[PDB]
Amino acid sequence: DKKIVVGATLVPGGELLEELKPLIKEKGYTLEVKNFDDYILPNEALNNGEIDANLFQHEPYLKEAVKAKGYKIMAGKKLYVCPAILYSYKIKSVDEFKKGDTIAISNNPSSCSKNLRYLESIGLLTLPKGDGLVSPKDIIENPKGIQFKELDIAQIPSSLPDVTAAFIDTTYAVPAGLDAKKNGIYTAPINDEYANLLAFRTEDKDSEKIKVLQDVLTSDKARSLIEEKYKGIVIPTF
Ligand code: MET
Ligand SMILES: [Cl-]
Ligand SMILES: [Cl-]
Ligand SMILES: [Cl-]
Ligand SMILES: [Cl-]
Ligand SMILES: [Zn+2]
Ligand SMILES: [Zn+2]
Ligand SMILES: [Zn+2]
Ligand SMILES: [Zn+2]
Ligand SMILES: [Zn+2]
Ligand SMILES: [Zn+2]
Ligand SMILES: [Zn+2]
Ligand SMILES: [Zn+2]
Ligand SMILES: [Zn+2]
User: Fold this and answer.
1) How far apart are CA 148 and CA 178, in angstroms?
2) Distance 6 CA to ligand 4 centre (A)
3) What is d(CA 79, CA 81) in angstroms, rounded to the nearest whole number?
4) How far is ligand 8, taken at its centre, from the CA of residue 18, in Å?
5) 47: number of CA atoms within 13 Å, CB side?
6) What sections of the protein cross the membrane (predicted)?
7) Strand spans (E) along 139-215
8) Which atom of ligand 1 is nearest to the CA of 81?
9) Last residue of a domain, which of 162, 188, 214?
10) 124 and 91 share one domain
11) 82 Cα nearest atom in ligand 1
12) Which of 105, 113, 142, 180 can bridge 133 by disulfide, Cβ–Cβ 3.0-4.6 Å?
């Protein structure tokens, strides 16, 4: 009734929501955060009706989820970007890549494709022109003989000792104890197309609960919380 149940991955959405509880209480609502540890279940729960909203994804991921699963869900206002970061225990600069080196990448086709294009933009390889999805099979030039290890996203943090470098979502990196200042060698450009945001059932588009959530999530308090906790790795888009 006056309870809002939001599903979220701990970092950054879960902890942001937790610190916004008092502000939500000021709007006359109680907030409960349901923790999820993966990118699949939060949307199921949302479409099932178990949660009022979720905070873990960007709109492109949601659109792909809607296409594959037929969820009746929707992206809200852009909140913050979480640029992909390339981590390494073995080198400090992308200039230090050499023959035989291995990069761990997600087996998600969109993430994989996007990661390969990041590596292209820094001159490490070349891909065919266009905007379609690319894979390691499509690499035209590969000067430094970089091999790619395609893994489940949950496995990538623990792979860092066994590979040269790895692309890891901040949602996975931070709870795994990875420090981007210490071990990050490349951060992806800011692109608000990939801004994480609140998602909710299309039916609840104009409901007060979603309205309350998006108010507090775009507040000055929300901005300062993001900046104070993540300092550079999660960037507000409001
Ligand atoms: C579940 S879509 C990926 C979300 C992740 N925090 C990112 O922006 O990279
Ligand atoms: Cl809670
Ligand atoms: Cl319905
Ligand atoms: Cl309703
Ligand atoms: Cl203001
Ligand atoms: Zn806290
Ligand atoms: Zn207040
Ligand atoms: Zn809680
Ligand atoms: Zn899970
Ligand atoms: Zn309903
Ligand atoms: Zn509702
Ligand atoms: Zn060095
Ligand atoms: Zn350089
Ligand atoms: Zn202000």
Assistant:
1) 21
2) 16
3) 7
4) 6
5) 14
6) none
7) 147-151, 165-168, 184-187, 196-201
8) 8
9) 188
10) yes
11) 8
12) 113
User: How many domains, in total, are found in the chain?
Assistant: 2
Would the CA dihedral through 152, 156, 162, 166 be positive or negative? positive
- Give the SS3 label for residue 49: coil
Residue whose pair of structure tokens reads 């991921």 in the numeric block: 61
Q: Are residues 89 and 184 in the same domain?
A: yes
Other Cβ atoms less than 10 A from the Cβ of 238: the count is: 15
Q: Where are the alpha helices (DSSP H) in the chain?
A: 15-19, 21-26, 41-48, 59-69, 109-121, 170-173, 180-183, 208-217, 220-230
- Looking at the chain, how many residues does it have? 238
Residue with token string 């792909």: 64
Q: How far is CA 1 from the centre of its chain?
A: 31
Verify that 54 and 111 share a domain, yes or no. Answer: no
Q: Which two tokens stand for residue 60?
A: 């492109």
Same domain (yes/no): 75, 15: yes
- Residues 40, 21, single domain; the answer is yes
Closest ligand, as measured to the CA of 203: 4
User: Do 80 and 196 meet the contact criterion of CB atoms below 8 Å apart?
Assistant: yes
Which residues have C-beta atoms less than 6 Å from ligand 1? 39, 56-58, 61, 82, 84, 169-171, 194, 196
Closest ligand 1 atom to residue 169 Cα is 9
- Amino acid occupying residue 136: P
Q: Which residues form the domain of 116?
A: 85-188
Which residue's CA is minimally distant from atom 8 of ligand 1?
A: 82
CA 235 to ligand 2 centroid distance, Å: 24
78 and 61 in one domain? yes
182 and 203 belong to one structural domain: no
Do 29 and 41 lie in one domain? The reply is: yes
Neighbouring residues of the ion ligand 9, judged by CB less than 5 Å: 37-38
